[PDB]
Design a protein around this motif. Structure first.
Motif, PDB file in Angstrom:
ATOM      1  N   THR A 150     -11.950  -8.315  -4.269  1.00  0.00           N
ATOM      2  CA  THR A 150     -10.736  -7.730  -4.819  1.00  0.00           C
ATOM      3  C   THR A 150     -11.112  -6.417  -5.497  1.00  0.00           C
ATOM      4  O   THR A 150     -12.247  -5.945  -5.388  1.00  0.00           O
ATOM      5  CB  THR A 150     -10.045  -8.702  -5.783  1.00  0.00           C
ATOM      6  OG1 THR A 150      -8.922  -8.055  -6.393  1.00  0.00           O
ATOM      7  CG2 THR A 150     -11.009  -9.156  -6.864  1.00  0.00           C
ATOM      8  N   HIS A 170     -15.999  -7.819   9.992  1.00  0.00           N
ATOM      9  CA  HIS A 170     -17.131  -8.558  10.548  1.00  0.00           C
ATOM     10  C   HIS A 170     -17.696  -7.759  11.710  1.00  0.00           C
ATOM     11  O   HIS A 170     -16.955  -7.400  12.630  1.00  0.00           O
ATOM     12  CB  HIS A 170     -16.699  -9.957  10.997  1.00  0.00           C
ATOM     13  CG  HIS A 170     -17.785 -10.749  11.655  1.00  0.00           C
ATOM     14  ND1 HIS A 170     -18.058 -10.669  13.003  1.00  0.00           N
ATOM     15  CD2 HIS A 170     -18.662 -11.648  11.147  1.00  0.00           C
ATOM     16  CE1 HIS A 170     -19.058 -11.480  13.297  1.00  0.00           C
ATOM     17  NE2 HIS A 170     -19.444 -12.085  12.188  1.00  0.00           N
ATOM     18  N   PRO A 195      -8.415 -18.392  11.989  1.00  0.00           N
ATOM     19  CA  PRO A 195      -9.011 -17.767  10.817  1.00  0.00           C
ATOM     20  C   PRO A 195     -10.473 -18.151  10.701  1.00  0.00           C
ATOM     21  O   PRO A 195     -10.882 -19.246  11.134  1.00  0.00           O
ATOM     22  CB  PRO A 195      -8.186 -18.323   9.652  1.00  0.00           C
ATOM     23  CG  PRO A 195      -7.577 -19.577  10.177  1.00  0.00           C
ATOM     24  CD  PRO A 195      -7.320 -19.313  11.625  1.00  0.00           C
ATOM     25  N   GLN A 219      -4.210 -10.654   5.322  1.00  0.00           N
ATOM     26  CA  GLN A 219      -5.402 -11.328   5.834  1.00  0.00           C
ATOM     27  C   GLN A 219      -6.153 -10.389   6.780  1.00  0.00           C
ATOM     28  O   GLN A 219      -6.157 -10.542   8.003  1.00  0.00           O
ATOM     29  CB  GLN A 219      -5.020 -12.632   6.521  1.00  0.00           C
ATOM     30  CG  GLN A 219      -4.357 -13.642   5.602  1.00  0.00           C
ATOM     31  CD  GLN A 219      -4.445 -15.057   6.133  1.00  0.00           C
ATOM     32  OE1 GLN A 219      -3.724 -15.433   7.056  1.00  0.00           O
ATOM     33  NE2 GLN A 219      -5.334 -15.853   5.551  1.00  0.00           N
ATOM     34  N   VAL A 220      -6.798  -9.394   6.177  1.00  0.00           N
ATOM     35  CA  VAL A 220      -7.607  -8.418   6.897  1.00  0.00           C
ATOM     36  C   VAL A 220      -9.071  -8.717   6.616  1.00  0.00           C
ATOM     37  O   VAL A 220      -9.496  -8.730   5.454  1.00  0.00           O
ATOM     38  CB  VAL A 220      -7.249  -6.979   6.491  1.00  0.00           C
ATOM     39  CG1 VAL A 220      -8.244  -5.999   7.090  1.00  0.00           C
ATOM     40  CG2 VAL A 220      -5.833  -6.643   6.929  1.00  0.00           C
ATOM     41  N   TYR A 221      -9.838  -8.956   7.673  1.00  0.00           N
ATOM     42  CA  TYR A 221     -11.244  -9.311   7.563  1.00  0.00           C
ATOM     43  C   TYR A 221     -12.109  -8.216   8.174  1.00  0.00           C
ATOM     44  O   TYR A 221     -11.652  -7.398   8.975  1.00  0.00           O
ATOM     45  CB  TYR A 221     -11.532 -10.655   8.243  1.00  0.00           C
ATOM     46  CG  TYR A 221     -10.731 -11.811   7.691  1.00  0.00           C
ATOM     47  CD1 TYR A 221      -9.435 -12.055   8.123  1.00  0.00           C
ATOM     48  CD2 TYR A 221     -11.272 -12.658   6.733  1.00  0.00           C
ATOM     49  CE1 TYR A 221      -8.702 -13.110   7.619  1.00  0.00           C
ATOM     50  CE2 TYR A 221     -10.547 -13.714   6.223  1.00  0.00           C
ATOM     51  CZ  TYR A 221      -9.262 -13.936   6.670  1.00  0.00           C
ATOM     52  OH  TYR A 221      -8.535 -14.988   6.165  1.00  0.00           O
ATOM     53  N   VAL A 279     -17.263 -16.995   4.561  1.00  0.00           N
ATOM     54  CA  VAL A 279     -16.582 -15.773   4.165  1.00  0.00           C
ATOM     55  C   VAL A 279     -16.654 -15.635   2.650  1.00  0.00           C
ATOM     56  O   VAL A 279     -16.652 -16.626   1.913  1.00  0.00           O
ATOM     57  CB  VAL A 279     -15.113 -15.759   4.654  1.00  0.00           C
ATOM     58  CG1 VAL A 279     -14.315 -16.878   3.999  1.00  0.00           C
ATOM     59  CG2 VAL A 279     -14.464 -14.406   4.401  1.00  0.00           C
ATOM     60  N   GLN A 334     -14.944 -13.576  -0.770  1.00  0.00           N
ATOM     61  CA  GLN A 334     -13.664 -13.036  -1.204  1.00  0.00           C
ATOM     62  C   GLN A 334     -13.897 -11.877  -2.162  1.00  0.00           C
ATOM     63  O   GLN A 334     -14.681 -11.996  -3.109  1.00  0.00           O
ATOM     64  CB  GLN A 334     -12.818 -14.118  -1.877  1.00  0.00           C
ATOM     65  CG  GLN A 334     -11.432 -13.655  -2.285  1.00  0.00           C
ATOM     66  CD  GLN A 334     -10.478 -13.584  -1.111  1.00  0.00           C
ATOM     67  OE1 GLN A 334     -10.434 -12.586  -0.392  1.00  0.00           O
ATOM     68  NE2 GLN A 334      -9.710 -14.648  -0.908  1.00  0.00           N
ATOM     69  N   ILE A 370     -14.225 -21.536   6.586  1.00  0.00           N
ATOM     70  CA  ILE A 370     -14.512 -21.428   5.161  1.00  0.00           C
ATOM     71  C   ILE A 370     -16.006 -21.624   4.916  1.00  0.00           C
ATOM     72  O   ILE A 370     -16.736 -22.192   5.738  1.00  0.00           O
ATOM     73  CB  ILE A 370     -13.673 -22.438   4.360  1.00  0.00           C
ATOM     74  CG1 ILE A 370     -13.566 -22.011   2.894  1.00  0.00           C
ATOM     75  CG2 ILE A 370     -14.264 -23.836   4.473  1.00  0.00           C
ATOM     76  CD1 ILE A 370     -12.946 -20.645   2.703  1.00  0.00           C
TER      77      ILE A 370
END
Lengths: 50, 50
Positions: A44, A5, A34, A1-3, A40, A42, A37
């Motif tokens: 990959t 911002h 966190p 869980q690396v964000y 954010v 997502q 929702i």
């Protein structure tokens, strides 16, 4: 869980140095909760490649 | 009899009338190469496709 911002390094007022020194101040990369929702996106490997 | 004008008697005034075909050419800035060689071996990957 690396964000990721964009954020600011805090710049203290430092007008009353004794008052600022008495109140502990610090900055961390840690997140208290966190991120909410729907605010954010997502990603990959395949999304980035596309 | 061959029904084709392989040899013609032409006056000097009509020598240049032969220029009637259309030609297209590229430029020095443009470079043309065969993608076939780049298909050698085929080691690589590919953005996802179906």
């Amino acid at each position: 869980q690396v964000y990721m911002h964009r954020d600011m390094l805090p710049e203290p007022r430092l007008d009353d140095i004794e008052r600022f020194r008495q109140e502990g101040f610090y900055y961390t990369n840690m997140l208290e909760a966190p991120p909410e929702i729907d605010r954010v996106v997502q990603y990959t490997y395949e999304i980035a490649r596309l | 009899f061959i029904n084709k004008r392989i040899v013609e008697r032409v006056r000097v005034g009509q020598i240049l009338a032969v220029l009637n075909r259309r030609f297209v050419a590229y430029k020095g800035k443009m470079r043309i190469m065969d993608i076939t060689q780049s298909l050698k071996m085929g080691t690589k990957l590919a953005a996802p496709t179906v």
